[PDB]
Scaffold this motif. Structure first.
Motif, PDB file in Angstrom:
ATOM      1  N   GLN A 105      77.027 -17.661 -10.329  1.00  0.00           N
ATOM      2  CA  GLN A 105      77.585 -18.942  -9.935  1.00  0.00           C
ATOM      3  C   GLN A 105      76.739 -19.726  -8.926  1.00  0.00           C
ATOM      4  O   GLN A 105      76.652 -20.957  -9.012  1.00  0.00           O
ATOM      5  N   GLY A 106      76.133 -19.034  -7.967  1.00  0.00           N
ATOM      6  CA  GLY A 106      75.273 -19.684  -6.990  1.00  0.00           C
ATOM      7  C   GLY A 106      73.999 -20.263  -7.589  1.00  0.00           C
ATOM      8  O   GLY A 106      73.537 -21.304  -7.145  1.00  0.00           O
ATOM      9  N   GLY A 107      73.433 -19.582  -8.591  1.00  0.00           N
ATOM     10  CA  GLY A 107      72.227 -20.042  -9.311  1.00  0.00           C
ATOM     11  C   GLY A 107      72.302 -21.451  -9.915  1.00  0.00           C
ATOM     12  O   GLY A 107      71.278 -22.111 -10.084  1.00  0.00           O
ATOM     13  N   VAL A 108      73.522 -21.886 -10.240  1.00  0.00           N
ATOM     14  CA  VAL A 108      73.803 -23.220 -10.790  1.00  0.00           C
ATOM     15  C   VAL A 108      73.702 -24.252  -9.665  1.00  0.00           C
ATOM     16  O   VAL A 108      72.997 -25.258  -9.820  1.00  0.00           O
ATOM     17  N   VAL A 109      74.401 -23.983  -8.552  1.00  0.00           N
ATOM     18  CA  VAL A 109      74.374 -24.849  -7.365  1.00  0.00           C
ATOM     19  C   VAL A 109      72.920 -25.062  -6.907  1.00  0.00           C
ATOM     20  O   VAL A 109      72.473 -26.189  -6.746  1.00  0.00           O
ATOM     21  N   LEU A 110      72.196 -23.965  -6.760  1.00  0.00           N
ATOM     22  CA  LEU A 110      70.821 -23.977  -6.291  1.00  0.00           C
ATOM     23  C   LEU A 110      69.836 -24.635  -7.288  1.00  0.00           C
ATOM     24  O   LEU A 110      68.824 -25.210  -6.855  1.00  0.00           O
ATOM     25  N   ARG A 111      70.140 -24.562  -8.593  1.00  0.00           N
ATOM     26  CA  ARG A 111      69.300 -25.183  -9.616  1.00  0.00           C
ATOM     27  C   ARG A 111      69.218 -26.717  -9.393  1.00  0.00           C
ATOM     28  O   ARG A 111      68.127 -27.320  -9.524  1.00  0.00           O
ATOM     29  N   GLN A 112      70.344 -27.314  -8.980  1.00  0.00           N
ATOM     30  CA  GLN A 112      70.429 -28.763  -8.715  1.00  0.00           C
ATOM     31  C   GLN A 112      70.008 -29.122  -7.286  1.00  0.00           C
ATOM     32  O   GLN A 112      69.268 -30.109  -7.089  1.00  0.00           O
ATOM     33  N   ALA A 113      70.451 -28.343  -6.295  1.00  0.00           N
ATOM     34  CA  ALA A 113      69.980 -28.540  -4.922  1.00  0.00           C
ATOM     35  C   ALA A 113      68.421 -28.589  -4.854  1.00  0.00           C
ATOM     36  O   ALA A 113      67.894 -29.409  -4.126  1.00  0.00           O
ATOM     37  N   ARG A 114      67.706 -27.782  -5.650  1.00  0.00           N
ATOM     38  CA  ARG A 114      66.228 -27.822  -5.687  1.00  0.00           C
ATOM     39  C   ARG A 114      65.719 -29.170  -6.204  1.00  0.00           C
ATOM     40  O   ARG A 114      64.668 -29.649  -5.755  1.00  0.00           O
ATOM     41  N   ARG A 115      66.467 -29.783  -7.126  1.00  0.00           N
ATOM     42  CA  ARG A 115      66.155 -31.138  -7.612  1.00  0.00           C
ATOM     43  C   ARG A 115      66.480 -32.181  -6.536  1.00  0.00           C
ATOM     44  O   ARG A 115      65.671 -33.076  -6.326  1.00  0.00           O
ATOM     45  N   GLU A 116      67.623 -32.045  -5.839  1.00  0.00           N
ATOM     46  CA  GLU A 116      67.995 -32.972  -4.741  1.00  0.00           C
ATOM     47  C   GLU A 116      67.034 -32.982  -3.511  1.00  0.00           C
ATOM     48  O   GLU A 116      66.765 -34.034  -2.926  1.00  0.00           O
ATOM     49  N   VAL A 117      66.524 -31.817  -3.140  1.00  0.00           N
ATOM     50  CA  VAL A 117      65.553 -31.683  -2.037  1.00  0.00           C
ATOM     51  C   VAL A 117      64.167 -32.260  -2.405  1.00  0.00           C
ATOM     52  O   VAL A 117      63.518 -32.875  -1.552  1.00  0.00           O
ATOM     53  N   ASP A 118      63.722 -32.034  -3.648  1.00  0.00           N
ATOM     54  CA  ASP A 118      62.546 -32.718  -4.241  1.00  0.00           C
ATOM     55  C   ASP A 118      62.794 -34.231  -4.315  1.00  0.00           C
ATOM     56  O   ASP A 118      62.063 -35.022  -3.708  1.00  0.00           O
TER      57      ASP A 118
END
Length: 121
Positions: A105-118
């Motif tokens: 479940q966390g891997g989904v949140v982090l998949r998008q957060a990595r796009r938001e920080v970029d």
């Protein structure tokens, strides 16, 4: 300097994002298995097994001191939470299964957060 300030505004914005990421990740732990450090009172041997303990409260203290410079750092800590639990606990336990679920479940949140920080820089 104005350059120092600008850098500080970027650290502050990252910290704002990482706090929301932390709440989302923590909601994937309804049982609160990962909320606090493992107790050395209740598991006196823990440190012989696990060299770098981590939990959500200790991530939160670091976060509020703006001690995460990037997302890589924050993810390292999140992964320690998962990874520590899957080592110390056996596969058939409620603790191991709770880490598997938080990872997934966390891997989904982090998949998008990595796009938001970029994306937001």
């Amino acid at each position: 300097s104005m350059e120092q300030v600008a850098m500080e505004l970027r650290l502050t914005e990252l910290t704002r994002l990482l706090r929301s990421v932390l709440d989302q990740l923590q909601d994937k732990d309804p049982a609160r298995i990962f909320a606090q450090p493992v107790s050395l009172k209740e598991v006196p041997d823990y440190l012989d097994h696990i060299k770098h303990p981590m939990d959500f409260a200790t991530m939160r203290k670091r976060l509020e001191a703006q001690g995460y410079k990037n997302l890589h750092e924050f993810e390292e800590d999140f992964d320690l939470i998962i990874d520590n639990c899957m080592k110390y606990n056996a596969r058939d336990t409620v603790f191991y299964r709770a880490a598997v679920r938080l990872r997934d479940q966390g891997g989904v949140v982090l998949r998008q957060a990595r796009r938001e920080v970029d994306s937001i820089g």
